[PDB]
Symmetry: D2
Subunit: 400 residues, 4 copies
């Protein structure tokens, strides 16, 4: 009748004792990792009883009681994708298939970007329940670049609301400005720079940057977030483009009262030069997918308003000149950047990061784009893809 007992019997298979490796394996095949923040108590307990292999009903109950709800959900098959092994097999195929696509040029406008190999290709999945999978180069760091644009937009809306933010920037797809003399949307450079000015006003750059990093940490569930000073230096050295825009926004009175624009550009470049991995960035995406809750910590990180707005803008303006085409064919909110990241959200299902340095003339990762098309081909995930009556296509949220 006890929860721990019920779970014990199901895992036990009628034996009297569960070998520790039998439970770990079973757990792993739900897609959870053993380093999941929410499973810390259980793993700490296992570490304890290991200092003294076989777990009886009472010893097991002692290890798992703190995390029984989550563990049951996993073992009952209540996660958003129940057959995660099958799903990861499919992800592996899509990865392999995109790997073959050798087209594209690596971004060479600064050394740091130009230094990355064309053969680097990673894909990471984090489910809204925290199920995690990776193939390829998922642990290498690289800079978010423009991929940071939704995240800081999220932050601004989180902190200030829709109304205040949208006083300063628009919300529709397109250096030039909209009808009302706002930049068109936070997904372009002009709008991003305006969004940059909004965040934590009245404290210095160092402080502001620390705030954004803490927030990024929560979104990633305390996985890898870093900073590239080198990238930062080269960006500031060579951003005549963004200097143009700043002076223009200044002239046109685009910033909030008492903005030091040159200082905001400096912040803006530091923001571009933040580093993630596939793995960490997928958690961030999963946060967006999960409604502002981090799927691995369980923390509320972003308001429902922040997340909805962000996904809306990722939809229509997220992939530079390919936005509209991407919305039509792929139908997922996403954002890319010049180091080859695409950050992809499949609302209520998962967050994804894809990384490959060579880009197409639109500015997007070749393999990343190829991968996203393939995903949507295979899976009902398109925004306007019916839940009942897909045509020929898989639904991973259905047992099979």
């Amino acid at each position: 009748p006890s929860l721990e007992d019920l779970l014990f019997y199901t895992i036990a298979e009628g034996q009297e004792k569960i070998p520790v490796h039998k439970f770990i394996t079973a757990l792993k095949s739900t897609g959870l990792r053993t380093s999941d923040p929410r499973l810390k108590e259980c793993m700490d307990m296992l570490r304890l009883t290991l200092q003294t292999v076989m777990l009886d009903k009472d010893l097991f109950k002692k290890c798992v009681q703190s995390n029984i709800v989550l563990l049951t959900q996993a073992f009952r098959r209540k996660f958003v994708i129940p057959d995660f092994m099958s799903f990861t097999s499919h992800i592996d195929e899509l990865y392999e298939s995109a790997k073959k696509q050798s087209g594209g040029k690596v971004a060479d406008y600064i050394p740091q970007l130009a230094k990355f190999s064309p053969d680097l290709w990673g894909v990471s999945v984090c489910t809204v329940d925290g199920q995690r999978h990776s193939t390829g180069d998922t642990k290498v760091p690289f800079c978010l670049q423009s991929c940071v644009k939704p995240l800081k937009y999220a932050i601004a809306v989180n902190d200030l609301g829709t109304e205040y933010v949208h006083r300063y920037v628009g919300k529709e797809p397109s250096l030039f400005l909209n009808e009302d003399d706002k930049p068109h949307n936070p997904m372009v450079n002009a709008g991003a720079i305006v969004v940059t000015s909004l965040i934590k006003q009245g404290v210095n750059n160092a402080e502001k940057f620390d705030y954004v990093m803490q927030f990024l940490n929560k979104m990633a569930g305390n996985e890898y977030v870093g900073f590239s000073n080198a990238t930062f230096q080269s960006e500031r050295e060579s951003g005549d483009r963004n200097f143009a825009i700043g002076y223009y926004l200044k002239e046109k009175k685009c910033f909030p009262e008492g903005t030091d624009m040159v200082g905001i550009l400096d912040f803006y470049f530091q923001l571009c030069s933040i580093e993630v991995t596939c793995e960490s960035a997928s958690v961030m995406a999963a946060t967006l997918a999960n409604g502002g809750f981090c799927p691995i910590t369980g923390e509320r990180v972003l308001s429902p308003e922040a997340v909805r707005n962000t996904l809306s803008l990722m939809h229509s303006c997220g992939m530079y000149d390919f936005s509209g085409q991407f919305a039509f064919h792929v139908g997922l909110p996403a954002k890319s950047g010049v180091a080859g990241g695409i950050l992809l959200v499949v609302p209520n299902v998962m967050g994804m990061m894809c990384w490959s340095p060579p880009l197409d003339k639109m500015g997007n990762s070749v393999k990343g784009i190829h991968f996203c098309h393939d995903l949507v081909s295979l899976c009902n995930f398109h925004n306007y893809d019916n839940l009942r009556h897909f045509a020929k296509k898989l639904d991973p949220r259905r047992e099979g």
Copy 2:
């Protein structure tokens, strides 16, 4: 024993369910008794009402005979397995919203042709059709009016059905625009007039206008589950008198070679004005919308009408280009695929949930119905049908699916 199970749950330990009781129970699911799918059942009840010894009473074997043919659907309806289980509560909310948008007396009625100018400003209707056929209506929901540009996604859908994404999008774009053309010399997308005219040319090539029109009308009949779909000659004549704009567009498309080989552009414009002049009611156009929300299956007839590719493409374009120059703002704030029309229609799809139509004739400075727009804003604020609302977490929205 499926029929037996349902009998015990309806009876409430009694031994004879009185007919009116079953009907009332059935209704509050949201189905209407006139549902195509429920026909065998209703026919049997009528039969036994005649032949019966009792006033009106059905014992187990009698109930079984009436419901057996339609048991699957009746079990879903009664086990609360439909998309919106607490339909009564949902319709109460719809009614509050309707009332609240009623007060919004703003706008002007289109007057560029007499037929449009005739409509009273105080006409206001809303109708709902679920992907399970649960129906509801408030206001002026049985009044015919013309689809106008509401017909644009419907005919686009037909074209993609018959021809495929690839063929169709040779001749027309798939992105919200910047009357002119895109960098590839295609009209920007089917939702604008230039691209609608091109889509019109794609449909049922090589047969006369009369045949083409019948083809489209039949298709519309199926989408609407054979509810009202009509023609307005009066509207049509007036459209063709005064479409110098569309004549402009046609001649420009002809110059730039945007039509298929052997298109007669003037005849195509005629077909176009006819398409615009098609009449619906709120009630029947909600079923049309629900076909689009139900993946191409008509939720009342259960009939496959449009391919999944067609339906998906049409919703993508209603998302981004459906509300003229308000499109962007609508996509952001409402987040629902929708098409507006100059008569005051707003065709609304909430994918996997329901279809609606909304009618009031005063329009704002953009082409769109004031009460419709206000209703849609209100609906989203209430209920978490926003495309990028979370299913599992939402602020204090309401989830009609959940209970």
Copy 3:
């Protein structure tokens, strides 16, 4: 006191007591006048009479007295170019030099245009004093096409004033419309179509076309003007472009009240189909050069307001997309046509028609353009050349 006829006799005589006719005819020709000049008709009629060979003072005086003023001007070297023989030698060189330029393509959108040989090339000059010269294929009818646009604009302004005309059409360089929903300028097709609707309102098409033809006669001092029905028929069959514009103009209410726009388009295609030689069109251009007086009849044809406005719009909008470049390097008011016409005006000096059928990709005659640039290199005709100081440039107005 001593007669004017007497004076001219002795100058031509050269102390010989009698002048033969042929000598006077040759003398007259070398001023650049033609013996068929309208203003010299009395004198030619007299010669025809008495020529039923040698002319004494008294006989001469009888022949020339009626036209003594114009003859004394010619002979006493008071015409705009005085060494006209030298000038024509230079025209001939320029004509040859532009000859060799065989580039370009002949327009082919209607059969009638596509027929013309690429090797046709004519250049006609008419001076404001009526001095004429020609090289090449100068007596071959072709259609003015858009070369008719300045002419009919001239007619409209003549008849209606600047203020009326410009209510309907704009006055600046660029189916779309200016800020105020007027077409940009009478030189583009949209504006030309509006200018067409302005002329002789309240009468049927046949009457309007007769009126325009009469006006064109006067402008050309009764030299060749004709109509190509064939051109007209083809134009009308295939002007989907102009049907587009007309419907658009109708929608935007660009025409005066009670215009039948379809009939206006009809007239518009008739105007485009009007036929000139180089010779006749050069006179037309000289009318514009000479302030609205026809230099060969001395008749006032257009008002100074008509002519000024027309030259202004020629300057800036006369050569399609090439216009700007043309104004800058050539600096002469000119209108080009799809048939290879370039109508060229050198204010206060002369009119020209250049014709060759191959066009460049701006739609302008290759050789016409090559010849126009050459003319300006040679002579201080450019609009912003200085009359007093100019570098190596020749100036035919001066005697040398």
Copy 4:
């Protein structure tokens, strides 16, 4: 050959009198429209000063005395006196200028530029007009001796210098020759030197490889010559204010730098500095009119006789003033006035009538196109009065007056 040029002139002035009184000669000379202080006349005026000291007959020149005074300058003096200048009846023409000036005076519209304090300081009521003929005949009315900044009035001048020194072909690699119709044209060149973006590129072309101080001096000397050594100067105060608040131009500079619009090895921020210095150069109506008259005279300066700009330079500059010279009123202006003209935000309009004269019009209130209201009114009136329009006919002008015509 028999009677001598100086002698002939003597009889024409003297009028059968054996002697010409000085004041008579001076008065006659002035009414040609020359100023006694004309550079070309300096020998004559020096001699008169001499003889006015060295003589018995206080004020009276005989034949021999007159000859000694005028002999050095006799050509230009015969031109003046024998009515061979471009406007022969200058005194009638100035009467006409006066009436137009008075009429423009009455126009009280406009707003004074306030984007910097130095501009905003100028009184609305200031209004001047200066005329300089291509023969050096001068006239002024109104506030002609007050200084003000050229602002964008400097743009054709520095363009002229660039083309003089480098040629059409070099210059137009970096800049367009057509009205725009901020943005770049099809070829990623600014549209034309008359817009700010194009002006900033023109600025970079001039005296490359030297420091700003040298460059500035080089432009100044050039301006001095165009003005016949009349006032040109500088407002450091204006310059400081420009550089503090030119976010617009910094925006442009950064954009031009990104799109590689400058010559190889350009320091763009230093270029901007030099640009603002140019905008801050000062003239008066009188001095700037001589500048304009240079341009109306195929690049010689009418008062010095000195060749200043190449013919090519001047022509190109007049072409661009025609089509792009009056911001967004350029097309209307070209149609209605038909003169090459440049305006500036201080209220200047620099106006050229080819082959006839140069003008400078100044009043500080601007209309919402940014041009001096009184300037614009004056220019329209000038055209309506006389046959100066571009495409006005020299022989047939319906009712209009022609200054060149002996009348």
